[PDB]
Structure formats: C-alpha cells, structure tokens
PDB file of C-alpha atoms and ligand atoms in Angstrom:
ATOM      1  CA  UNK B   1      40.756 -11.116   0.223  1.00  0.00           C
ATOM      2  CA  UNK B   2      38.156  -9.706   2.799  1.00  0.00           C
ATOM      3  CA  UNK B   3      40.707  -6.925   3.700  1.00  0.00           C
ATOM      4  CA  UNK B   4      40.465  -4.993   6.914  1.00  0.00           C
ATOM      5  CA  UNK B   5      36.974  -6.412   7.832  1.00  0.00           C
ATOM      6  CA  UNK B   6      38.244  -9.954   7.185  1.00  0.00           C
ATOM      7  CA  UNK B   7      41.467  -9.890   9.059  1.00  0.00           C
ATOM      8  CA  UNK B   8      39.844  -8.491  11.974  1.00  0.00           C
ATOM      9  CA  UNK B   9      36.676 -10.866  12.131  1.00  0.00           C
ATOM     10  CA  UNK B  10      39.369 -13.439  11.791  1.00  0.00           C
ATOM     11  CA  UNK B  11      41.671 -12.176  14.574  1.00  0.00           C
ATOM     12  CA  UNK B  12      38.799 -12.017  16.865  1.00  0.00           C
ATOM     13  CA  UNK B  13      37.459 -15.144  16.585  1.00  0.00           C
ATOM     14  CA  UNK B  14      40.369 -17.245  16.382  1.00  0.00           C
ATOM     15  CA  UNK B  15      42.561 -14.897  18.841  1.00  0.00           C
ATOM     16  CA  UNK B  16      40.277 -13.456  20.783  1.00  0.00           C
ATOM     17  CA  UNK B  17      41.779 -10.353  19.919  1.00  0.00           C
ATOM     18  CA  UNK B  18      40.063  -6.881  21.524  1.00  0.00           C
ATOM     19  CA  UNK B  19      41.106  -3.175  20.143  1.00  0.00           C
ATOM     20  CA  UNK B  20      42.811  -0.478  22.914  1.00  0.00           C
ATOM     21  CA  UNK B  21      39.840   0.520  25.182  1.00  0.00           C
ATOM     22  CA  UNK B  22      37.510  -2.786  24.505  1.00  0.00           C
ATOM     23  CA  UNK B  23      36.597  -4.275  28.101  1.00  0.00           C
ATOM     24  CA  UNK B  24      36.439  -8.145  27.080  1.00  0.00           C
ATOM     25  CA  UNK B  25      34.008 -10.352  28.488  1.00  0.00           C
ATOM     26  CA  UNK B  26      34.119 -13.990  28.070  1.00  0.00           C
ATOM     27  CA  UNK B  27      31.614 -16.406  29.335  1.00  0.00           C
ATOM     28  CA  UNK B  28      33.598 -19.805  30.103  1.00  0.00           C
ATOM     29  CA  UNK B  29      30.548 -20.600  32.408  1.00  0.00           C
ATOM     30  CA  UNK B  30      29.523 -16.797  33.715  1.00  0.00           C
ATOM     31  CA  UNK B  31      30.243 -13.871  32.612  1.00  0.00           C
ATOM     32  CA  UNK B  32      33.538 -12.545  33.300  1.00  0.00           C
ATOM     33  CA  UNK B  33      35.609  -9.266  32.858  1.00  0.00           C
ATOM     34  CA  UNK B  34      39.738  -8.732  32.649  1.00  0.00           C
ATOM     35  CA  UNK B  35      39.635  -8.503  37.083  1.00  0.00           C
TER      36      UNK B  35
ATOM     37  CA  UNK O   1     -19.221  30.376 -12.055  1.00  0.00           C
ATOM     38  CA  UNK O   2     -17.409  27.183 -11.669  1.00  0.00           C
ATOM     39  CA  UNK O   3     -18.915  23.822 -10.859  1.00  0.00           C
ATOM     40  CA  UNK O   4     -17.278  20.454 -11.582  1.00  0.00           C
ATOM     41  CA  UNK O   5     -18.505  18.329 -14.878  1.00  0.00           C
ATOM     42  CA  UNK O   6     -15.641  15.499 -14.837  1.00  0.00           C
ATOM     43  CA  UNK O   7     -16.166  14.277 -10.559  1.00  0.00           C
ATOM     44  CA  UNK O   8     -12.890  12.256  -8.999  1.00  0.00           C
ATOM     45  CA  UNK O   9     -13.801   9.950  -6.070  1.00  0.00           C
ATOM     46  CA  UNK O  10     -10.814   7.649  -4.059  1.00  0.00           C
ATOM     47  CA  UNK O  11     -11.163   5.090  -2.111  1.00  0.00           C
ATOM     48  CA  UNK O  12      -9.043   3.156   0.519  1.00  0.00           C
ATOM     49  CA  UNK O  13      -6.655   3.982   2.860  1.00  0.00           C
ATOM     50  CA  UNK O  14      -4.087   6.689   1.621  1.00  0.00           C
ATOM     51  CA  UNK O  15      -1.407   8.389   3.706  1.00  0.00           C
ATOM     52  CA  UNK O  16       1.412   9.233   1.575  1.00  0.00           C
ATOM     53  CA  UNK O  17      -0.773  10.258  -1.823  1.00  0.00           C
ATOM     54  CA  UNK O  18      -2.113  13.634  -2.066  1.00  0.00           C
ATOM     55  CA  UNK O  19      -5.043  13.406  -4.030  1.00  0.00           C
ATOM     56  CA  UNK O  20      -3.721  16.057  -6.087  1.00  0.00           C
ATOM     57  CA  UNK O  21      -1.445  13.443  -7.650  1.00  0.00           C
ATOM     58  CA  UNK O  22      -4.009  11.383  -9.342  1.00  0.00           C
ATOM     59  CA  UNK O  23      -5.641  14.303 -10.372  1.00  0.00           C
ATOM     60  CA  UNK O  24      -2.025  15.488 -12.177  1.00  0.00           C
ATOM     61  CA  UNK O  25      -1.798  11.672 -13.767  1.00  0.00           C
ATOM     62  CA  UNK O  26      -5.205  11.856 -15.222  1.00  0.00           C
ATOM     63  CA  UNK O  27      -4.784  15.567 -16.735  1.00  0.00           C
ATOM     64  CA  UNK O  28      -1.184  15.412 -17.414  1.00  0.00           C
ATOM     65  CA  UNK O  29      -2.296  12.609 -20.091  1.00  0.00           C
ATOM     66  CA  UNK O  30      -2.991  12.901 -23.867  1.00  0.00           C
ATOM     67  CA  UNK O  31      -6.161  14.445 -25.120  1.00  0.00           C
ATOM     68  CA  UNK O  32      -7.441  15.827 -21.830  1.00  0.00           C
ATOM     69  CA  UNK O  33     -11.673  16.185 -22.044  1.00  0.00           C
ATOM     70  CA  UNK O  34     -11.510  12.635 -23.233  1.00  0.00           C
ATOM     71  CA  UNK O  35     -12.001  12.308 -19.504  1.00  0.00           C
ATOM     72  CA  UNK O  36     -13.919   9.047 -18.982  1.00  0.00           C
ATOM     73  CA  UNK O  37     -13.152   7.428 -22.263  1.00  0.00           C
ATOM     74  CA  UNK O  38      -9.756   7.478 -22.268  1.00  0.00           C
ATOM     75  CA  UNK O  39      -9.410   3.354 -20.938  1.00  0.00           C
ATOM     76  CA  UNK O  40      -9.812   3.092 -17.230  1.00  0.00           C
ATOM     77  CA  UNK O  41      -6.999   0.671 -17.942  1.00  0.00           C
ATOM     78  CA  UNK O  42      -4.546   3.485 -19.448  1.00  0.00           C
ATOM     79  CA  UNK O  43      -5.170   5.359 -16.388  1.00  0.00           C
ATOM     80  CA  UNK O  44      -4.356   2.658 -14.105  1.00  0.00           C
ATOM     81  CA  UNK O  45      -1.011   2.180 -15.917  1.00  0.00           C
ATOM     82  CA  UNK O  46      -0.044   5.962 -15.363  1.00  0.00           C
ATOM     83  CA  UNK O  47      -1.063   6.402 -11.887  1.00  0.00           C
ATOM     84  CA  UNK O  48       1.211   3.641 -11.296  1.00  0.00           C
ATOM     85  CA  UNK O  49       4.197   4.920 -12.673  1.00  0.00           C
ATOM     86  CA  UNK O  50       3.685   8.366 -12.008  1.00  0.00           C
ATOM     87  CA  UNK O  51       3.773   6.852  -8.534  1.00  0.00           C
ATOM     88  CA  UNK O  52       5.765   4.198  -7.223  1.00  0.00           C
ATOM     89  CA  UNK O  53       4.136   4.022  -3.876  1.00  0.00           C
ATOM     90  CA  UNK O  54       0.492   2.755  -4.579  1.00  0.00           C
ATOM     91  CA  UNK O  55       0.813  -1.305  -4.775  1.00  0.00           C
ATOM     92  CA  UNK O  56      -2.729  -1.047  -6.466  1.00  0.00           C
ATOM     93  CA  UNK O  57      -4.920   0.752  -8.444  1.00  0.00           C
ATOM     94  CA  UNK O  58      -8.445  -0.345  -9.073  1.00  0.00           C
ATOM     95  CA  UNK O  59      -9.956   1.874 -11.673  1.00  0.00           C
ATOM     96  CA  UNK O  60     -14.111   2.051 -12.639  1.00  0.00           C
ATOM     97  CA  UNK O  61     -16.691   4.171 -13.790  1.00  0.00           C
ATOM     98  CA  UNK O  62     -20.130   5.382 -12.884  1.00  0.00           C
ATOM     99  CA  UNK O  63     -22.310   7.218 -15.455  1.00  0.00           C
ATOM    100  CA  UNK O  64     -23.089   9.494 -16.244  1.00  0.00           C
ATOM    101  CA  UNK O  65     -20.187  11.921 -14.495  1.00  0.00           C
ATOM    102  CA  UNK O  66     -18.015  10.206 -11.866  1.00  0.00           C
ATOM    103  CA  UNK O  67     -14.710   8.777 -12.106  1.00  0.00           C
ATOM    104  CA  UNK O  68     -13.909   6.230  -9.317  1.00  0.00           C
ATOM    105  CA  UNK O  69     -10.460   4.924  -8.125  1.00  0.00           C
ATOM    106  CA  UNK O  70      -9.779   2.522  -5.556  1.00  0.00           C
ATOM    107  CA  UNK O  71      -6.125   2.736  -4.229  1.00  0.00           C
ATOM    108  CA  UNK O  72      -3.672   0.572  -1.831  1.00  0.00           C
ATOM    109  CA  UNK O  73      -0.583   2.034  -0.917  1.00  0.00           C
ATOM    110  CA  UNK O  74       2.642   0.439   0.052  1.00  0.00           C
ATOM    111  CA  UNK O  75       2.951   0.026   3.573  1.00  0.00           C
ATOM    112  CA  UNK O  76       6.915   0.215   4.727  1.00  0.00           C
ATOM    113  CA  UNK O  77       8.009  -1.778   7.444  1.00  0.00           C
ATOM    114  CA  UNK O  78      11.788   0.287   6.967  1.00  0.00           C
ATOM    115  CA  UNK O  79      13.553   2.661   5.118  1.00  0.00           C
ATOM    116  CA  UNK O  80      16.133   0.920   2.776  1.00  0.00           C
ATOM    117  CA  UNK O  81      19.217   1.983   1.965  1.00  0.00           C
ATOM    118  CA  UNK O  82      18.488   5.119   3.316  1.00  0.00           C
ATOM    119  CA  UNK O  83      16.482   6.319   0.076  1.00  0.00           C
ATOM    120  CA  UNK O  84      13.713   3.659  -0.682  1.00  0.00           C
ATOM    121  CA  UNK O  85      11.168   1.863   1.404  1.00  0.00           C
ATOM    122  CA  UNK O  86      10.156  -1.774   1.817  1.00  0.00           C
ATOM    123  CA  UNK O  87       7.076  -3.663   2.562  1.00  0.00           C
ATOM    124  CA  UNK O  88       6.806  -7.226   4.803  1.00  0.00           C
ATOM    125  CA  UNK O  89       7.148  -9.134   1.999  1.00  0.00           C
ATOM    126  CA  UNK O  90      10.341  -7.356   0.457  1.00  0.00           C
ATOM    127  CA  UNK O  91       9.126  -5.367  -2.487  1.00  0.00           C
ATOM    128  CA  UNK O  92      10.923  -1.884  -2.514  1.00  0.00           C
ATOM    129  CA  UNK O  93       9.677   1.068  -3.342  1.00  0.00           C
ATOM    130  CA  UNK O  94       9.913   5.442  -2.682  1.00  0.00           C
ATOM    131  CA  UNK O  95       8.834   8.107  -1.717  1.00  0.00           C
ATOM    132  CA  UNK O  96       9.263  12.029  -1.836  1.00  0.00           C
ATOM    133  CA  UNK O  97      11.267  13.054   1.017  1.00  0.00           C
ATOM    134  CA  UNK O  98       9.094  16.125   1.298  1.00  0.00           C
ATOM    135  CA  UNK O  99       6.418  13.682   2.510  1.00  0.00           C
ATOM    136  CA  UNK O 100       6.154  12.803   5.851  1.00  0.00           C
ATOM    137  CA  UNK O 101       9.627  12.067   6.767  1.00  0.00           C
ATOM    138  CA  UNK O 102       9.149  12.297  10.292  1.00  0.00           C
ATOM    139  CA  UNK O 103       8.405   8.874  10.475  1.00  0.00           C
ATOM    140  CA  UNK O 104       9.718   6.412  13.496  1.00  0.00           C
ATOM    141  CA  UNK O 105      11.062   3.951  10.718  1.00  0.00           C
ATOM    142  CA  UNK O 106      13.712   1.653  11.107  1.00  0.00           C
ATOM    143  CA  UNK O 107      16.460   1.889   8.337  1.00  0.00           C
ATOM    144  CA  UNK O 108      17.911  -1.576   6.761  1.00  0.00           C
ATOM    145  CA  UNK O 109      21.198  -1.465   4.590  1.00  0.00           C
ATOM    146  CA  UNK O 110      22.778  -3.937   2.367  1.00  0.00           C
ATOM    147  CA  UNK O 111      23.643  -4.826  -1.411  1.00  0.00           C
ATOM    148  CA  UNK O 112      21.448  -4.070  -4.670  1.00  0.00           C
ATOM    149  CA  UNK O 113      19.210  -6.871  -4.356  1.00  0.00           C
ATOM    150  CA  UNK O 114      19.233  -8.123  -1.105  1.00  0.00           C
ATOM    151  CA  UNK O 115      16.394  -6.073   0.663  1.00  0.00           C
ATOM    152  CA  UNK O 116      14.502  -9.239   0.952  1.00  0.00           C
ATOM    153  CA  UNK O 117      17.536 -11.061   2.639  1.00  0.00           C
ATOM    154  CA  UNK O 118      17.876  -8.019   4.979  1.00  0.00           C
ATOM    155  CA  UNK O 119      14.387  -7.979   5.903  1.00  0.00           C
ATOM    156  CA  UNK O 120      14.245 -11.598   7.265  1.00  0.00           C
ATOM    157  CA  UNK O 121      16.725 -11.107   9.068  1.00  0.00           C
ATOM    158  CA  UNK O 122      15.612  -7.843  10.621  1.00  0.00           C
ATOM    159  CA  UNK O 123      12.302  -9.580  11.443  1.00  0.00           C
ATOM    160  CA  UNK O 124      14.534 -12.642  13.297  1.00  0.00           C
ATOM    161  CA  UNK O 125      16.535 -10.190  15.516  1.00  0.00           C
ATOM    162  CA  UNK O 126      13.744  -8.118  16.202  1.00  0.00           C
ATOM    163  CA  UNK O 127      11.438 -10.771  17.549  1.00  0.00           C
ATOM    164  CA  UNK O 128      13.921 -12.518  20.075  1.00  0.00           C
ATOM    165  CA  UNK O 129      15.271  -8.255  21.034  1.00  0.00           C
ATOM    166  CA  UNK O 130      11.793  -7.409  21.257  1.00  0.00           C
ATOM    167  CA  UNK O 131      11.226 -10.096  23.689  1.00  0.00           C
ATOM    168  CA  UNK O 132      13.565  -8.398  26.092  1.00  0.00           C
ATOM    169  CA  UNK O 133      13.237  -4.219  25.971  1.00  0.00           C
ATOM    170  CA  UNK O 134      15.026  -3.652  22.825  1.00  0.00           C
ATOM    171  CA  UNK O 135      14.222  -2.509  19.907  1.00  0.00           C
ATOM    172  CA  UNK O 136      15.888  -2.192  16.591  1.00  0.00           C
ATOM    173  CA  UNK O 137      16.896   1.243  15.225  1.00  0.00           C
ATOM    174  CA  UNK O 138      19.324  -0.251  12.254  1.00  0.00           C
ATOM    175  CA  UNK O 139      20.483  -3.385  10.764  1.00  0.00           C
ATOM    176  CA  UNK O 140      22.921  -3.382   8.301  1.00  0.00           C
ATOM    177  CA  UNK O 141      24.001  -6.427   6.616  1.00  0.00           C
ATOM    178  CA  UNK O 142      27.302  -5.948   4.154  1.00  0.00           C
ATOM    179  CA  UNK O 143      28.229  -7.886   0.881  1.00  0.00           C
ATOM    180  CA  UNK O 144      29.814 -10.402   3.179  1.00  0.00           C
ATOM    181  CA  UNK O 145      27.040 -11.079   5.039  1.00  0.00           C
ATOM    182  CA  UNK O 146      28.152  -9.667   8.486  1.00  0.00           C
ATOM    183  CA  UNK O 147      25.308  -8.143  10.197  1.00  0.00           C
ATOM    184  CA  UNK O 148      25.709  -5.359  12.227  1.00  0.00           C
ATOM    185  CA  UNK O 149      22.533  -3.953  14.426  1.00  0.00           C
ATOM    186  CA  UNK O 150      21.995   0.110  15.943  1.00  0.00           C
ATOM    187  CA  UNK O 151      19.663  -0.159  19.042  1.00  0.00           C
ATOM    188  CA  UNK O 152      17.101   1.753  20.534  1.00  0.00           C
ATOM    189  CA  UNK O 153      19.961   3.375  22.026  1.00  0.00           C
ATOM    190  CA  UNK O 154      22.567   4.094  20.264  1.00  0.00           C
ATOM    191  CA  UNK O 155      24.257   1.196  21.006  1.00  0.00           C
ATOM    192  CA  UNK O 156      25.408  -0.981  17.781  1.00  0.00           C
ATOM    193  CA  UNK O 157      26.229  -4.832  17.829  1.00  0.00           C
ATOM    194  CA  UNK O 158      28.686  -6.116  15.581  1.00  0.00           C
ATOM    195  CA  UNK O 159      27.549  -9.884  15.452  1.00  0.00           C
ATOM    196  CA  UNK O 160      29.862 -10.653  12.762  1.00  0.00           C
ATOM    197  CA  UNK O 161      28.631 -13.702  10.103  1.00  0.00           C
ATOM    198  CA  UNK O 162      28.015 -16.778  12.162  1.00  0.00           C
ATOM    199  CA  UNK O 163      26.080 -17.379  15.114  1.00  0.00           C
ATOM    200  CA  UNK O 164      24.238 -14.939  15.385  1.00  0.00           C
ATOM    201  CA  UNK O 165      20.879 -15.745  17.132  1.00  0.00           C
ATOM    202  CA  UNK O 166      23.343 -17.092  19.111  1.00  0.00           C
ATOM    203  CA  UNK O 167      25.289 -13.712  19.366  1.00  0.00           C
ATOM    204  CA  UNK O 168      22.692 -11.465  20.375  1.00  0.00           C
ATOM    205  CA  UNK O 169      21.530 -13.724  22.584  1.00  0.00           C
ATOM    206  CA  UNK O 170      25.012 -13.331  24.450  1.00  0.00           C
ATOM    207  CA  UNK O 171      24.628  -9.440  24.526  1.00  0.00           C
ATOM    208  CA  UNK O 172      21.174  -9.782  26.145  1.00  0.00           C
ATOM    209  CA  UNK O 173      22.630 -11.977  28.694  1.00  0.00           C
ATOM    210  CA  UNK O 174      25.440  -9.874  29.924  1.00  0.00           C
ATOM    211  CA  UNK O 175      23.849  -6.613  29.004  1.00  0.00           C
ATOM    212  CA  UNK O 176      22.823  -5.653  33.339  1.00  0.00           C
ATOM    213  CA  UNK O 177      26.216  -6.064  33.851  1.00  0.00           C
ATOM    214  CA  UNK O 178      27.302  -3.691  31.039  1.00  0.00           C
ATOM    215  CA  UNK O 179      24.770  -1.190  32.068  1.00  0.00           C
ATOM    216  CA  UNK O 180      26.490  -1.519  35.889  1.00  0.00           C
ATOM    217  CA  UNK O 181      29.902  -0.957  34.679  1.00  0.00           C
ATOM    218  CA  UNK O 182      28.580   1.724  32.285  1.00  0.00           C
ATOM    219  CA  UNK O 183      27.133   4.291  35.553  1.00  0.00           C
ATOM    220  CA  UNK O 184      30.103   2.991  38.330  1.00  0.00           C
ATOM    221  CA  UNK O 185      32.280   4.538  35.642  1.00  0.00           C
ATOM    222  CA  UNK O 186      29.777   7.374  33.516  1.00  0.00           C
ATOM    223  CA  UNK O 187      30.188   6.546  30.068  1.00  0.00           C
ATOM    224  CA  UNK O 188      28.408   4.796  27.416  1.00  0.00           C
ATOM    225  CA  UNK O 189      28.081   1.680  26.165  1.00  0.00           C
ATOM    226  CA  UNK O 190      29.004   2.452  22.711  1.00  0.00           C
ATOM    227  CA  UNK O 191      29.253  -0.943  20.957  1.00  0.00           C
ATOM    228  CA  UNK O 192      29.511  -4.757  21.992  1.00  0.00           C
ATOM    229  CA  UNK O 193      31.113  -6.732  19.370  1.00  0.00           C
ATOM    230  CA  UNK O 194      30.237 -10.503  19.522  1.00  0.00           C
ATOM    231  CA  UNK O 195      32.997 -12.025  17.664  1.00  0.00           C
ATOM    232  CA  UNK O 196      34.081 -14.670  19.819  1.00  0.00           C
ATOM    233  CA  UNK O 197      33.001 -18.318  20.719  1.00  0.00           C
ATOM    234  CA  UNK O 198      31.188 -17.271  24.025  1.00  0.00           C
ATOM    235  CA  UNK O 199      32.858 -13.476  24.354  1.00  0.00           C
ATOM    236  CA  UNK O 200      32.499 -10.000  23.741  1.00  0.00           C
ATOM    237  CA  UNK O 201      34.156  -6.723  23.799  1.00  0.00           C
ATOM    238  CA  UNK O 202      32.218  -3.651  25.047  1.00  0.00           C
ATOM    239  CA  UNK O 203      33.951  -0.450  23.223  1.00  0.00           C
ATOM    240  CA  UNK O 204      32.584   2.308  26.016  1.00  0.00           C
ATOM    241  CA  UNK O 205      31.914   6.593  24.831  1.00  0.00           C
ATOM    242  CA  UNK O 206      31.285   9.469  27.370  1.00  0.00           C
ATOM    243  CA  UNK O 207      27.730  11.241  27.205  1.00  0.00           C
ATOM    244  CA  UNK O 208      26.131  13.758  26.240  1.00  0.00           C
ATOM    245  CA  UNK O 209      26.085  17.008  28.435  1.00  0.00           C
TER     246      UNK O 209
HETATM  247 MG1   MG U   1      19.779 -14.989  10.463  1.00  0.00          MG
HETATM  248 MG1   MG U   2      32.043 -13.740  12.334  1.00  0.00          MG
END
C-alpha cells in the first residue's frame, strides 16, 4: 500500500498538506510564507 | 638470541591494516616453517579473506629469505548502512570498529543491494550542495526510493521520490530566508520537506544551551 509514508507523500503533493508547527513556503514566483 | 630467518616486507599505502594481520594470515596457516613454499598464491587467497578491506594483494618472493607483499586497501568514500564501508565505484566492504572510527565519513543507508544506487546519488546531491556551502552528513534512500539527506548541520531534507535535483535546488534557494526567520525567532531549522510542486515546509527545533 505504501502506508504512512505513502499517504503522507501523497497528501503533500497533491494537497499541499503541512503537519502542526511546519511554516509553508511556496514559490508561485518568489518565495512566500503564510503572512 | 633472536634474529629473524623468515623476513616480511609490505608495500603500498596501508591505513587500516596493522601489519600484524598479515603476519597472523601467514602463521595462522597449515604447516607453518613451510614459510616461502607454501604458494605465494595460497597466501594471497587468505590474506584476502582473513581481511575484507585490502582490494589487492600482490604476493612475490626474493631468495634466499624475504617474503614480499604488495597491498591496496579499500578506500571508503562512506560508511554504509552504518556497519560496512563503500568505495567510488560501489563495492562494499568492513572494517573493525576498533580501528580508526574517528573518521569524518559520511554514512549512506538503503536496501541490501542498493549501495551502488545510493552512492550515485550521494555523489549527484553532493556536487550541486557542495557548490553552495553545504555539505552532506547523511543520505538515506528507502525501499521506495524516497531520498532523504542530514546536512552539515543537522538539518535533514525530505525530498521525497521525484524531482529531486529539482528539490534541493528549491531548499538552496530559500534557505537565507530560513536562516532569517530561524534567529528573528531563536530556534532551529530542523527539517525542510520538499514535497510540493514549487513548496516547502520548514519543521523549526530550539537549540542547544
Ligand atoms: Mg537522482
Ligand atoms: Mg515525492
């Protein structure tokens, strides 16, 4: 199945999904945090 | 009073064999005073299992007393699996931990047979991270082929399985503004986990006191 590791790599990717404490920085062009 | 009758000479460059350790193949043999008859190809084949660090051993004699024995010795590039050794070009080997073991060595992880795999890529991350000031402490690649690299700090990047030259090239983009937001707050980064078309997420720790 991929289990734990596969569920999150999926979540992450497709959700763009952090954990509680993660400061997320996406890059639509620049870099960029929550603000 | 003693004096030698059977002389030992080695050659080559040798840090982790004590020459002690031929010495114990050669001895620890059958029929020991058939010193420089028994074949110098019989001895090659036990100092090589006795040890599984020497990647050669060139064997000869020279009448009338003198045994001579050229050796190479593998030269590790990392520590694999936390318990063996491997070379540039991927062949794994050991050591005795009572050896030197204070060695700055990298340490690369993954499945049975895949310390070749490993080692490319730990030579293609390393390059483009050395060419910034990173180096790499770890890289750990799992069954599933997600890679997952300890720093020079102890910073770890989860790059996942895909893009990853692409990946770690996004965490040495953004990583002056991590290292502001790590001091206007003083913690850590801990991780950055790549994940994401075009993102990350920084998971921050406090410091040691
Ligand atoms: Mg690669
Ligand atoms: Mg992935």
């Amino acid at each position: 199945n991929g289990g734990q590791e596969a569920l999150e790599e999926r979540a992450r990717n497709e959700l763009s999904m952090t954990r509680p404490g993660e400061t997320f920085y996406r890059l639509v062009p620049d870099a960029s945090k929550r603000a | 009073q003693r004096l030698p009758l059977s002389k030992l000479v080695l050659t080559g460059e040798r840090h982790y064999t004590r020459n002690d350790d031929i010495r114990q193949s050669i001895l620890a043999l059958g029929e020991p005073g058939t010193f420089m008859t028994q074949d110098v190809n019989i001895i090659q084949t036990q100092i090589e299992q006795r040890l599984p660090w020497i990647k050669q051993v060139s064997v000869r004699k020279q009448w009338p007393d003198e045994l001579k024995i050229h050796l190479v010795e593998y030269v590790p590039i990392a520590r694999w699996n936390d318990q063996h050794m491997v070379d540039a070009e991927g062949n794994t080997f050991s050591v005795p931990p009572e050896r030197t073991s204070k060695q700055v060595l990298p340490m690369l992880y993954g499945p049975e047979g895949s310390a070749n795999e490993v080692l490319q890529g730990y030579r293609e991350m390393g390059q483009m991270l050395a060419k910034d000031r990173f180096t790499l402490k770890e890289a750990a690649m799992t069954a599933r082929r997600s890679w997952q690299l300890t720093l020079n700090n102890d910073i770890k990047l989860n790059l996942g399985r895909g893009d990853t030259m692409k990946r770690l090239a996004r965490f040495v983009e953004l990583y002056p503004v991590l290292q502001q937001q790590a001091q206007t707050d003083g913690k850590r980064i801990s991780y950055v986990d790549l994940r994401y078309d075009s993102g990350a997420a920084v998971g921050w720790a406090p410091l040691p006191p």
